[PDB]
């Protein structure tokens with residue numbers, strides 16, 4: 001009798017544009033193969049659609065209003081409370097905990113040390129080639145180097161001749177080989193960068209998605225019923241040279257159709273590129289015969305809009321920005337134990353069945369208790385309200401029962417996002433704490449998304465639910481794309497019904 005290892009794979013800005021989530025265009029065979037042996041959650045949502053608030057949230061198992069981290073300019077242990085993290089908890093329980101790539105968000109939000117010395121057994125590994133993503137590293141048709149958003153590259157014509165996710169993969173495999181020697185179990189966090197911008201990927205993956213067979217988003221127009229407060233102006237992508245040359249109007253655009261299809265091409269290519277890296281990682285796991293002793297959790301920190309509602313990037317409460325993939329492989333539980341190989345590398349350039357599936361509405365803040373339980377450790381207790389004074393507790397439910405009384409909150413996935421004003425402006429994507437004046441709280445059920453943009457006081461961290469600036473109500477059955485806001489024609493009977501037993 002032993003304890004199970006954990007391989008946690010986190011992808012930056014990955015929406016569920018994957019074969020195992022019903023996307024019949026994107027080629028993600030290795031992830032689909034992971035899913036075929038796993039439990040796939042169809043309705044998983046991040047608590048805030050931006051890197052640091054989301055990552056600090058689900059790494060401490062607390063919600064953004066407990067971490068009080070809505071930007072990326074505060075360290076929770078000083079700002080809110082000495083909240084313990086997932087890897088810290090495993091390390092305290094005899095695990096060797098290791099971080100590769102972007103797990104914590106770098107900078108102050110992790111105290112510049114990836115939350116050292118609490119979380120990791122040794123200083124995390126960050127791939128060196130990441131620092132060239134936003135340099136003049138994209139060779140154009142006329143032979144010059146540019147800092148382009150769409151950046152298909154020959155690996156032999158970039159600095160250091162590699163890419164950050166290839167480095168992360170290589171280093172993760174080596175650590176797995178080392179741990180096969182150790183007597184202790186491992187908790188390995190691998191944080192992949194793509195499809196986060198820029199779209200710098202091996203140019204061969206671009207051939208998988210010819211532009212002729214690329215369509216726009218189903219709802220590329222900005223909906224009439226979308227209140228301006230809920231619109232994000234996607235300012236970060238406007239700084240890239242190729243984007244800047246199009247002279248796209250601020251803040252509503254639109255992006256020229258041809259470039260919209262090119263963005264989707266490069267995003268899909270980056271996903272397939274990501275998929276091969278995951279393939280290499282999982283295939284190495286198989287060769288080392290760790291498949292029968294290692295939990296694999298695969299998810300993302302938030303989504304990314306590709307023209308839906310005239311939006312791009314995250315910084316939103318729409319499903320496209322909050323809906324994330326979430327897959328759990330549990331040896332001998334989600335699939336039969338394996339010289340059998342479960343994750344052989346699959347080549348997307350070669351032209352499966354859905355594994356277990358769950359439609360329950362779940363939240364990234366439930367990641368902490370789930371992994372702790374699945375690994376055989378003690379599940380931290382539920383948090384009180386507030387829990388600033390508590391170091392180890394969880395505000396989300398454990399999903400372990402789901403692998404074989406109706407509280408209304410078990411029917412909800414919560415999301416939120418701040419705004420500095422009602423009209424989209426320069427900092428509406430990523431407002432700093434002092435500049436936050438509105439907080440958009442969103443409720444997502446199997447039936448609808450209900451959002452209210454309410455007055456917010458950043459000095460007291462106080463929401464005023466009597467100062468509603470605007471509201472949104474989208475119905476899954478009739479309006480899955482969320483194009484027809486029904487909040488003005490509503491009275492609140494949907495919330496009442498949810499409360500009534």
Ligand SMILES: *[C@@H]1O[C@H](CO[C@@H]2O[C@@H](C)[C@@H](O)[C@@H](O)[C@@H]2O)[C@@H](O[C@@H]2O[C@H](CO)[C@@H](O)[C@H](O)[C@H]2NC(C)=O)[C@H](O)[C@H]1NC(C)=O
Nearest residue numbers: 077078081082083084088089092117118119390391392393
């Ligand atoms: C913040 O907490 C860390 C670690 O918290 C540990 O885990 C919690 C679940 C709870 O059981 C705590 O009592 C545990 O200590 C603190 O780090 C410890 O600090 C003490 C002395 O300060 C030291 O002797 C221990 O070795 C440290 N352990 C670890 C794992 O780092 C830290 O001090 C706390 N910081 C503040 C400001 O309270």
Ligand SMILES: *[C@@H]1O[C@H](CO[C@@H]2O[C@@H](C)[C@@H](O)[C@@H](O)[C@@H]2O)[C@@H](O[C@@H]2O[C@H](CO)[C@@H](O)[C@H](O)[C@H]2NC(C)=O)[C@H](O)[C@H]1NC(C)=O
Nearest residue numbers: 454455456457458460461462463464465466467468469470
């Ligand atoms: C919390 O909000 C209430 C209500 O907000 C008011 O109504 C909104 C629709 C919008 O018009 C806001 O600008 C309004 O303030 C606040 O209640 C108001 O309080 C002020 C000062 O005490 C008073 O002059 C107003 O008459 C009140 N309005 C109502 C409708 O009661 C309340 O002050 C807010 N609380 C905090 C802590 O900011």
Ligand SMILES: *[C@@H]1O[C@H](CO)[C@@H](O[C@@H]2O[C@H](CO)[C@@H](O)[C@H](O)[C@H]2NC(C)=O)[C@H](O)[C@H]1NC(C)=O
Nearest residue numbers: 075076077078079082110111112113115116117
């Ligand atoms: C976050 O890290 C910084 C630096 O690593 C800590 O600030 C100082 O760090 C040095 C270590 O080089 C210590 O000797 C000092 O005592 C630290 N100063 C203070 C005021 O603590 C900082 O403390 C860390 N934050 C937390 C919450 O532990």
Ligand SMILES: *[C@@H]1O[C@H](CO)[C@@H](O[C@@H]2O[C@H](CO)[C@@H](O)[C@H](O)[C@H]2NC(C)=O)[C@H](O)[C@H]1NC(C)=O
Nearest residue numbers: 224225226227468469470471485486487488489
């Ligand atoms: C929902 O109703 C609100 C108010 O009932 C609308 O907001 C108003 O818009 C008019 C312009 O048509 C402004 O003059 C008012 O000042 C606004 N009201 C407030 C309180 O600011 C809103 O446009 C409606 N939305 C939809 C989709 O019908």
Ligand SMILES: *[C@@H]1O[C@H](CO)[C@@H](O[C@@H]2O[C@H](CO)[C@@H](O)[C@H](O)[C@H]2NC(C)=O)[C@H](O)[C@H]1NC(C)=O
Nearest residue numbers: 001002003288289290291292293337338339340
């Ligand atoms: C997982 O499977 C591998 C091979 O599929 C098992 O490898 C054995 O490991 C034990 C000690 O861990 C060795 O004594 C054996 O020689 C290995 N090979 C075989 C064929 O048994 C491994 O034990 C399995 N892990 C668990 C927890 O059962």
Ligand SMILES: *[C@@H]1O[C@H](CO)[C@@H](O)[C@H](O)[C@H]1NC(C)=O
Nearest residue numbers: 207208209210211212213214
């Ligand atoms: C688009 O897909 C169809 C279906 O396989 C294929 O025949 C066609 O060649 C594709 N488009 C291009 C430009 O190759």
Ligand SMILES: *[C@@H]1O[C@H](CO)[C@@H](O)[C@H](O)[C@H]1NC(C)=O
Nearest residue numbers: 243244245246247248249250
């Ligand atoms: C961008 O467009 C505006 C009006 O649409 C025009 O005035 C301006 O000169 C354009 N800039 C460039 C660099 O073409």
Ligand SMILES: [Ca+2]
Nearest residue numbers: 012013051301
């Ligand atoms: Ca992100």
